[PDB]
């Protein structure tokens, strides 16, 4: 009541962080570009994915060196919400991490090449006219690129340059274009787009087809266009967003563990 809540609790955290039940009563709380449940804070990358830090203390000792950057910019706050399709860049080690969705429905820092780690994609939420009658995009990231093409519509991605501010490569939202899912049940799945239903009132949905010919649906808010009909602007994680079945995921896992 009475104002914004400064604590978040463990358990009442998101499940896709995979913070454990014991070993803490509270969990780190991420406001930044991204939402609370559609992001992951910079602490649980460093300690609970990348395994650089042990403790919450040690993440302060890393981040206040000014070694961590995101989007070619130094972020000093340890609880910064670093979300979908943000680049992370550490100068020592000289390795870069683009955050994608894993096929199971988790965040994972996908390691990438140095030339690839310049650019990143931003799907545009809407397009809107600012003052002096100038046009302007706005993104899922909460950037606002201005003077686009007239070409560029809602619900489609743009390759940003990052080294400079400006856009470079557009993409369109149509049938036969590659598209990852960012939320809901089918998260972490990439497939070409077959068809979308309108439903003139609320909630457009899209059916789309995995590269092993599995068909599945999501709302348009969740869908995020990568690239053209086959091929893709970005590098993909392990499995490339197929999501193999429950008995298959059993068989591959226990076949691994026997060595």
């Amino acid at each position: 009541a009475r104002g914004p809540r400064k604590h978040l609790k463990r358990i009442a955290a998101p499940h896709h962080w995979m913070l454990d039940k014991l070993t803490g009563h509270y969990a780190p709380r991420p406001p930044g570009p991204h939402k609370l449940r559609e992001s992951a804070p910079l602490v649980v990358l460093l300690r609970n994915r990348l395994r650089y830090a042990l403790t919450y203390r040690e993440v302060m000792m890393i981040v206040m060196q000014r070694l961590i950057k995101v989007d070619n910019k130094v972020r000093t706050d340890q609880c910064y919400p670093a979300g979908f399709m943000d680049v992370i860049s550490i100068e020592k080690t000289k390795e870069n991490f683009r955050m994608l969705f894993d096929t199971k429905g988790r965040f994972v820092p996908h390691p990438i090449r140095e030339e690839e780690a310049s650019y990143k994609l931003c799907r545009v939420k809407k397009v809107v006219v600012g003052p002096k009658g100038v046009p302007a995009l706005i993104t899922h990231d909460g950037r606002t690129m201005r003077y686009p093409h007239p070409s560029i519509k809602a619900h489609d991605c743009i390759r940003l340059d990052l080294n400079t501010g400006k856009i470079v490569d557009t993409l369109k939202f149509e049938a036969g274009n590659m598209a990852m899912v960012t939320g809901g049940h089918n998260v972490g799945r990439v497939g070409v787009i077959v068809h979308r239903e309108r439903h003139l009132g609320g909630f457009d949905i899209i059916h789309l087809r995995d590269a092993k010919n599995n068909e599945f649906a999501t709302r348009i808010s969740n869908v995020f266009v990568i690239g053209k009909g086959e091929k893709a602007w970005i590098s993909l994680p392990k499995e490339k967003g197929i999501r193999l079945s429950i008995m298959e995921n059993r068989q591959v896992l226990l076949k691994k563990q026997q060595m």
Binding site: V134, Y147, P150
Partner: protein, 220 residues
Amino acid sequence: MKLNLANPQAGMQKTVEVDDEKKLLPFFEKRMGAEVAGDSIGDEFKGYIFRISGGNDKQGPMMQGVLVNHRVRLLFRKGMKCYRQRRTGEKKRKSVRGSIVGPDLAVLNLVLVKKGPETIPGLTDAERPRRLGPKRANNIRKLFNLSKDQDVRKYVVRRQIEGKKKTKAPKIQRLITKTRVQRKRAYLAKQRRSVIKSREEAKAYKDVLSAYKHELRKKR
């Protein structure tokens, strides 16, 4: 009863006890900020005149403008007298003496305007000098009268401390200098640069959208 006599200009003061009733009788039914004659307070006090500033009564404050001859309870805002705030926005109710003077209060505080011929042993004899000279720049200028072109710096006030060799000095705020004038030039450069960038972005875009919609006329 116990008159606290203040010299403003010297910076000296000392309390005195009042024998008898009749020496207090000029002061009764008088406001704060009233120039009362201080001939009849005692023997040595001759040809004086005293403004009356405040006081406290047995209870132990009076504030000007309240009026009345007795203690009262008031709700205090921020920026009143006789109240330090603990919290921001805190008002509080608090007992306070009237401004008009009576017998039953303990202390009157008095401030002299014009001293007479005679000397007081407490007040008149000495002069305590002022501790801090002026920090900011045009306050130093108005002290000694410099115009502007005389320049500050050398007209600083520096006492030196006892024992070890050391001076201490105010650091003059609002002083014109190499860092301060450059910060305008750095700021005003960005205001110049940010306009002409955004203007050329608009001029570049104007031909691009015309180049787009001309290629759309080919489709017709």
